[PDB]
Design brief:
Disulfide bonds join 45-75, 52-70, 56-76. By secondary structure, the chain is α+β, with helices and mostly antiparallel strands. It is 25% helix and 23% strand.
Length: 79
């Protein structure tokens, strides 16, 4: 129902997630929404403030907004 999410925009997903967003739309809207690829689902998001790890520490959390660009992992951040 809901079209592509805004997180992928100006974000940075991995190789598997990238190919996914492409199928939903196409390499055009995928390259126009400002989407960067990373070594894998684990990458940095929300600018140089959050990162992606299998899980996050207690003093940190999971930016529910960028949890998408992450994929199987979770983009944790500092509140």
């Amino acid at each position: 129902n809901p079209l592509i999410p805004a997180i992928y925009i100006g974000a940075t997903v991995g190789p598997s997630v990238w190919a996914y967003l492409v199928a939903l739309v196409g390499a055009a809207a995928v390259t126009a929404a400002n989407i960067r690829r990373a070594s894998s689902d684990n990458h940095s998001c929300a600018g140089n403030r959050g990162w992606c790890r299998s899980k996050c520490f207690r003093h940190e959390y999971v930016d529910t907004y960028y949890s998408a660009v992450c994929g199987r992992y979770f983009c944790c951040r500092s509140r």
